[PDB]
Design an enzyme around this catalytic site. Sequence first.
Site, PDB file in Angstrom:
ATOM      1  N   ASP A 156       0.836  -1.121   0.107  1.00 30.70           N
ATOM      2  CA  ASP A 156       0.048   0.071  -0.041  1.00 30.70           C
ATOM      3  C   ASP A 156       0.828   1.252   0.153  1.00 30.70           C
ATOM      4  OD1 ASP A 156      -2.176   1.866   0.889  1.00 30.70           O
ATOM      5  OD2 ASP A 156      -0.911   1.877   2.706  1.00 30.70           O
ATOM      6  N   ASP A 200      -8.340  -0.788   6.192  1.00 30.54           N
ATOM      7  CA  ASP A 200      -7.997  -0.021   7.618  1.00 30.54           C
ATOM      8  C   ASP A 200      -9.120  -0.784   8.623  1.00 30.54           C
ATOM      9  OD1 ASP A 200      -6.642   1.597   6.195  1.00 30.54           O
ATOM     10  OD2 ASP A 200      -7.102   3.420   7.143  1.00 30.54           O
TER      11      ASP A 200
HETATM   12  C1  LIG Z   1      -8.349   7.695   7.610  1.00 29.50           C
HETATM   13  C2  LIG Z   1      -8.479   8.225   6.460  1.00 29.50           C
HETATM   14  C3  LIG Z   1      -8.617   9.575   6.736  1.00 29.50           C
HETATM   15  C4  LIG Z   1      -6.970   7.752   5.808  1.00 29.50           C
HETATM   16  C5  LIG Z   1      -7.410   7.663   4.292  1.00 29.50           C
HETATM   17  N1  LIG Z   1      -6.428   6.699   3.569  1.00 29.50           N
HETATM   18  C6  LIG Z   1      -7.008   5.350   3.133  1.00 29.50           C
HETATM   19  O1  LIG Z   1      -8.216   5.359   3.018  1.00 29.50           O
HETATM   20  C7  LIG Z   1      -6.030   4.418   2.605  1.00 29.50           C
HETATM   21  C8  LIG Z   1      -5.622   4.823   1.092  1.00 29.50           C
HETATM   22  C9  LIG Z   1      -6.534   5.702   0.423  1.00 29.50           C
HETATM   23  C10 LIG Z   1      -7.827   5.145   0.207  1.00 29.50           C
HETATM   24  C11 LIG Z   1      -8.542   5.798  -0.980  1.00 29.50           C
HETATM   25  C12 LIG Z   1      -8.326   7.164  -1.130  1.00 29.50           C
HETATM   26  C13 LIG Z   1      -7.263   7.731  -0.850  1.00 29.50           C
HETATM   27  C14 LIG Z   1      -6.135   6.971  -0.229  1.00 29.50           C
HETATM   28  C15 LIG Z   1      -6.646   3.173   2.587  1.00 29.50           C
HETATM   29  C16 LIG Z   1      -5.392   2.107   2.114  1.00 29.50           C
HETATM   30  O2  LIG Z   1      -4.596   1.917   3.200  1.00 29.50           O
HETATM   31  C17 LIG Z   1      -6.108   0.743   1.773  1.00 29.50           C
HETATM   32  C18 LIG Z   1      -4.960  -0.334   1.605  1.00 29.50           C
HETATM   33  C19 LIG Z   1      -5.344  -1.712   1.887  1.00 29.50           C
HETATM   34  C20 LIG Z   1      -5.386  -2.258   3.058  1.00 29.50           C
HETATM   35  C21 LIG Z   1      -5.696  -3.710   3.204  1.00 29.50           C
HETATM   36  C22 LIG Z   1      -6.157  -4.549   2.078  1.00 29.50           C
HETATM   37  C23 LIG Z   1      -6.092  -3.832   0.876  1.00 29.50           C
HETATM   38  C24 LIG Z   1      -5.713  -2.565   0.765  1.00 29.50           C
HETATM   39  N2  LIG Z   1      -6.880   0.783   0.635  1.00 29.50           N
HETATM   40  C25 LIG Z   1      -7.823  -0.044   0.503  1.00 29.50           C
HETATM   41  O3  LIG Z   1      -8.437  -0.916   1.175  1.00 29.50           O
HETATM   42  O4  LIG Z   1      -8.311  -0.306  -0.884  1.00 29.50           O
HETATM   43  C26 LIG Z   1      -9.342   0.295  -1.395  1.00 29.50           C
HETATM   44  C27 LIG Z   1      -8.741   1.626  -2.267  1.00 29.50           C
HETATM   45  C28 LIG Z   1     -10.287  -0.321  -2.462  1.00 29.50           C
HETATM   46  C29 LIG Z   1     -10.229   1.083  -0.236  1.00 29.50           C
HETATM   47  C30 LIG Z   1      -7.245   9.137   3.465  1.00 29.50           C
HETATM   48  O5  LIG Z   1      -6.215   9.349   3.146  1.00 29.50           O
HETATM   49  N3  LIG Z   1      -8.268   9.925   3.453  1.00 29.50           N
HETATM   50  C31 LIG Z   1      -8.050  11.230   2.479  1.00 29.50           C
HETATM   51  C32 LIG Z   1      -8.046  10.995   1.050  1.00 29.50           C
HETATM   52  C33 LIG Z   1      -8.839  12.115   0.398  1.00 29.50           C
HETATM   53  C34 LIG Z   1     -10.182  11.575   0.036  1.00 29.50           C
HETATM   54  C35 LIG Z   1     -10.915  12.349  -0.652  1.00 29.50           C
HETATM   55  C36 LIG Z   1     -10.482  13.738  -1.063  1.00 29.50           C
HETATM   56  C37 LIG Z   1      -9.155  14.280  -0.673  1.00 29.50           C
HETATM   57  C38 LIG Z   1      -8.427  13.197  -0.032  1.00 29.50           C
HETATM   58  C39 LIG Z   1      -9.161  12.141   3.032  1.00 29.50           C
HETATM   59  N4  LIG Z   1      -8.785  13.511   3.060  1.00 29.50           N
HETATM   60  O6  LIG Z   1     -10.096  11.960   3.200  1.00 29.50           O
END
Ligand SMILES: CC(C)C[C@H](NC(=O)[C@H](Cc1ccccc1)C[C@@H](O)[C@H](Cc1ccccc1)NC(=O)OC(C)(C)C)C(=O)N[C@@H](Cc1ccccc1)C(N)=O
Length: 282
Positions: A156, A200
Amino acid sequence: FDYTMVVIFVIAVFTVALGGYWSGLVELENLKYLTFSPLTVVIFVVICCVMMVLLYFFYKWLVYVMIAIFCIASAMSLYNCLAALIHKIPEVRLIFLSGLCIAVAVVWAVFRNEDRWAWILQDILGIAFCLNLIKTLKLPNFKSCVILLGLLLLYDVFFVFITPFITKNSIMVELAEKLPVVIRVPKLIYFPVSILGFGDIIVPGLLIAYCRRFDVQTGSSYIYYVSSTVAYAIGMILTFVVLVLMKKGQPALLYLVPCTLITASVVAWRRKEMKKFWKGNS
Ligand SMILES: CC(C)C[C@H](NC(=O)[C@H](Cc1ccccc1)C[C@@H](O)[C@H](Cc1ccccc1)NC(=O)OC(C)(C)C)C(=O)N[C@@H](Cc1ccccc1)C(N)=O
């Protein structure tokens, strides 16, 4: 700081502290499932990588396929969870529950566009799916836990950080007709939404489920489970702080896997039980 960031933390901890706790509940009655293997774990990780690449490069039909599969799986998981909840309090009841669940799933399928009020349906479906998948997936021992968490962490972190340096388009900037996997919550000041992946909730959920299973097996009451939930909550808070103070998206696995693994290793080592906790009973 915002009120929405609080809600995601509560959902991401309530449904992991309940998914983990429920896993030990069935374990108690068994003493009165698709267990994973290290090779199986590596195969699952590779298949996850291939599925993600296919999603990014073949998006147009893969989005609809994923929506259909998620709808059916979430309807089944919601039915299972609701039946388990209702069974405690004293069939036609099962048929009515299945009908209500399929009606909710169909309404979600036909109302995936309006982000004003479809986020409630998607959150409920996601919570049910995560709870059922945490209950049904059992890990054999801590070796599988560590291997899976480390491989997912590296995978990831790579997918979110190294991909921008090459691909002209982060892959996750497109992955979040949107994907039906991420939890969506709008700004809870008047209703721009937040996003939390199912990973997560699931992978640390699997670790907490295994911790609760070990608790039940050994004899200890609540040590490992409480420790893991506390560390998971602290990891979520740290990820939120880093995301806000960094002004960019952040892979939470990076601030979740080290905390959970360190706390589990420490709590297992303080009692001199690392070898048993690592081999796996029976
Ligand atoms: C706790 C949460 C706040 C953290 C969140 N991070 C996340 O959610 C991570 C990466 C991600 C996902 C979707 C979009 C961006 C980044 C999740 C990431 O760690 C996991 C990795 C994984 C884990 C186990 C099995 C398989 C995969 N992704 C995952 O599970 O697969 C998908 C993408 C299908 C959901 C995040 O950065 N959110 C940001 C991203 C964003 C979203 C919308 C607009 C702007 C920015 C936010 N500010 O909301």
